[PDB]
Amino acid sequence: QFTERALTILTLAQKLASDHQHPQLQPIHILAAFIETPEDGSVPYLQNLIEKGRYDYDLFKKVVNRNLVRIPQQQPAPAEITPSYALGKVLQDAAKIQKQQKDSFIAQDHILFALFNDSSIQQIFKEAQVDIEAIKQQALELRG
Amino acid sequence: QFTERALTILTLAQKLASDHQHPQLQPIHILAAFIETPEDGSVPYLQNLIEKGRYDYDLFKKVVNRNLVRIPQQQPAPAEITPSYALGKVLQDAAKIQKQQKDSFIAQDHILFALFNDSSIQQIFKEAQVDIEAIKQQALELRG
Numbered sequence: 662q663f664t665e666r667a668l669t670i671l672t673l674a675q676k677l678a679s680d681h682q683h684p685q686l687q688p689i690h691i692l693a694a695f696i697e698t699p700e701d702g703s704v705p706y707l708q709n710l711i712e713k714g715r716y717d718y719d720l721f722k723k724v725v726n727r728n729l730v731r732i733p734q735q736q737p738a739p740a741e742i743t744p745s746y747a748l749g750k751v752l753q754d755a756a757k758i759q760k761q762q763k764d765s766f767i768a769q770d771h772i773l774f775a776l777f778n779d780s781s782i783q784q785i786f787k788e789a790q791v792d793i794e795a796i797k798q799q800a801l802e803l804r805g
Numbered sequence: 806q807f808t809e810r811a812l813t814i815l816t817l818a819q820k821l822a823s824d825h826q827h828p829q830l831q832p833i834h835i836l837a838a839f840i841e842t843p844e845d846g847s848v849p850y851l852q853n854l855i856e857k858g859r860y861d862y863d864l865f866k867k868v869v870n871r872n873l874v875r876i877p878q879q880q881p882a883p884a885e886i887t888p889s890y891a892l893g894k895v896l897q898d899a900a901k902i903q904k905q906q907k908d909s910f911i912a913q914d915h916i917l918f919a920l921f922n923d924s925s926i927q928q929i930f931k932e933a934q935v936d937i938e939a940i941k942q943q944a945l946e947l948r949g
Contacts, residue, residue, distance in 0.1 A: 761907055763949055 662756075666769040670694045670705060671752065678741040682734045685742045688780045689732065691751060691772065692725040704803060710773055714795030724787045731784075751775045770800035808910040811899075814838045814849060815916065819888065826879040828886040833872045835892065835920050840866045849917055854943040858935025865934060868926055895919050914944050 663671070673694035678686050681693070695705035702708065712718040744752070754775035755767045764771070777791050807815060818838035822830040839849035840862065846852055855862040888896075899911045899919035908915065921940055926933045934940065 761905075763907065 663767040664769065667755070667767040667772055670769045670772050671748075673697045674748070675741050675744075679737070680740075681729055681732070682737060682740045683729075683732045684735050684739050686744050686748050687728075687732070688747060688751070688776055689725060689728040689783075691748065691776045692721070692780065693729055695773065695776075696722050696725050704800075705769065705773060708803075710770070710777075710796035710799040711789075713799045715792040716789045720787055720789055724782050724784075724789075727786060728783060751779055754778065768800075770803075773800065806910060807899075807916070808912055810913040811911045811916040814913050815896075817841055818892075819885075823885050825873060825876050826881055826884040827876050828878070828880075828883045829889040830887070830892055831876070831889060832891060832895070832920060832924055833869065833876070835895070835916075836869050836924065837873060839917065839920075840869060848947070849913055853934075854917070854940050855934045857943045858939040860932065860935055862934075864932050868928075868932055872926075891923070895923050898922055912948070914947050918944060 671691070671694070674686060674691040677693045677697060678684075678690045683690065697703070698706060700706065704710065706722075707718055709718050709721075711721050751772065752767075752775070755771035758771040758774055759765070759767055762768075762771070774793075774796060777796055778793065780791065782788055814835070815838070818835040819830055821834040821837045822828075825834070827834070841847070841850070843851060848854065850862055850866075853862060855865060896916075896919070899915050902915045902918055903909075903911055906915070918937075918940060921934060921937055924933065925931075935943075
């Protein structure tokens with residue numbers, strides 16, 4: 662169903678929520694997966710669909726880090742309670758994307774897309790459009 | 806743009822407008838383009854969505870012919886003026902479908918779908934090609 666890369670990004674969303682002591686998984690945690698590493702080679706962080714597309718990766722980095730700080734510290738036992746409908750939908754949308762893209766496996770780009778398509782900055786501190794075409798262009802020019 | 810399979814149908818539709826010496830191309834000429842000749846592989850007519858959808862494609866051809874004979878004029882010099890705004894819409898719709906499918910070219914599959922969206926038989930119990938949902942059920946067996 663998923664590529665190893667897609668599984669890595671999703672898995673990181675889940676484990677970052679555990680490491681940050683966060684309850685229900687939010688779009689924020691998948692965004693946390695995106696900015697999980699300083700490696701530029703990680704498309705979700707520097708050689709990004711955002712950075713080479715329309716917006717400063719830092720804009721997004723701070724959206725997420727602000728949100729990760731904002732979410733209160735939980736008992737480790739609930740730290741990653743569930744993907745709920747929120748991540749369920751992102752993963753399902755990634756599958757809808759596979760169908761649209763005619764892709765045999767879920768790509769990390771489908772997760773980037775699906776998350777971005779659903780997501781919006783939750784606070785006034787940062788703003789950015791979900792520039793769907795820019796993120797698709799950059800995704801299409803990489804790996805394949 | 807359109808590939809050769811779609812272009813064949815589109816070419817035939819325009820030809821048919823001239824075969825009937827009509828000033829403009831109408832949806833009926835395209836439906837007539839769908840049913841040109843008894844060549845099985847022609848998804849628009851024989852190994853079609855229509856039979857799979859439990860409809861009689863020859864009966865439908867009779868419907869088409871009944872509509873073709875109602876074309877108001879067959880005057881020579883007046884013939885071949887326009888593709889018509891009506892089909893402008895249809896071809897534009899085909900382009901919309903290409904976007905929906907991430908397709909670099911319009912296939913007969915797409916041009917069929919687009920007309921079907923704008924097609925009709927002025928009949929309650931239409932003997933028309935099976936409605937769009939079935940069109941998708943069977944059209945989606947093609948390519949991918």
